[PDB]
């Protein structure tokens, strides 16, 4: 009868918003404010920059990104204690009585 | 002349608010909403009930 719910797995999600940043230097490992709310997803990577990118120094740069994260579908997984759980049995006689 | 700023180390802080939670001592690993915002600090531990 009584379950209790442990876990939420989602099989599907979607993204939006999803800002990103890079410092360009050497100096610094870039940061972005929405990296604060863990509801976003974040990653650091490294690319490069320079006069084409326009800014500093000509090197392989740090860069970041984040995204809003929301899931439509789930798994409800629950557990039940070795209590109110019950079996139902039919114990049937032989001896005639048609059908 | 021109510097540029890389790093922020803080030598001191303070705490407040600071909610906490537990599920009961099998099913589940407890959760709390403010664990969301990484501006908080979080930890799991285990006690008993």
């Amino acid at each position: 009868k009584h379950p209790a719910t442990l876990r939420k797995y989602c099989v599907e999600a979607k993204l939006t918003n999803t800002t990103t940043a890079s410092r360009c230097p050497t100096q610094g490992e870039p940061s972005l404010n929405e990296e604060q709310d863990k509801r976003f997803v974040c990653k650091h990577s490294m690319v490069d920059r320079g006069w084409g990118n326009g800014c500093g120094l000509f090197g392989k740069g740090g860069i970041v990104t984040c995204a809003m994260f929301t899931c439509k579908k789930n798994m409800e997984g629950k557990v039940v204690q070795p209590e109110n759980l019950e079996y139902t049995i039919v114990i049937t006689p032989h001896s005639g009585e048609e059908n | 002349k021109h510097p540029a700023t890389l790093r922020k180390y803080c030598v001191e802080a303070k705490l407040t608010n600071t909610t906490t939670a537990s599920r009961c001592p099998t099913q589940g690993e407890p959760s709390l909403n403010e664990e969301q915002d990484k501006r908080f600090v979080c930890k799991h531990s285990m006690v008993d009930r």
Partner: antibody
Amino acid sequence: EVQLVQSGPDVEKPGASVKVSCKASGYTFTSNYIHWVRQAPGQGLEWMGVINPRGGSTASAQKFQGRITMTRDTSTSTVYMELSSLRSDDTAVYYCARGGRALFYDSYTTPRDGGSWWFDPWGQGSLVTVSS
Amino acid sequence: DIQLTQSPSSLSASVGDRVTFTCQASQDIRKYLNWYQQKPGKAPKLLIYDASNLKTGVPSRFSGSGSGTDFTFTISSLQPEDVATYYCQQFDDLPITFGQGTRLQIK
């Protein structure tokens, strides 16, 4: 005495968020559970959610999933309910009240029960209207 | 999930009469049920807990009954100040839920 004073009625624009306060007195503010129950005028009672003064544990109903945050100030012995993405359906009166509480964190069934849900001293209610 | 049915939706009655309500549960709720009285413009109020029990400070004409899925609230003698809407409350499992309510009209 056992007492609850909620903040006064408010009106907001759709999609907004509103913050209603629940202050209590007459007991140990950490000794009872808090729940929020809403009543739409053309409807009966609906259970929004729950917060525990001690420690901060919380829970909410499926209907309001994603839409409602609960916090507290122990120093003031006060609870705060907040609803987000306000919509006209949200227009109703809100209520808060207590439970006689075993201890740490919030929600129990097996340990007997509270023996109410905003009916004894949940407060005086407060009206909130979502309108343009 | 747990669907609490309340009957009847409304009643009109003369003073002194005995009145009863019935709440039926989609699941066995055992002894967890409640009976509210609420007067208009007032917060709801306590009457019955564990389906069986008066609160202190509640008049004695009130009673409650029923066990597995089914329950009955009763006022022995209708009294005019009792005009209100009444409710029953399932606490079990905690997807906390109420009965739809029953209004009274004095005769």
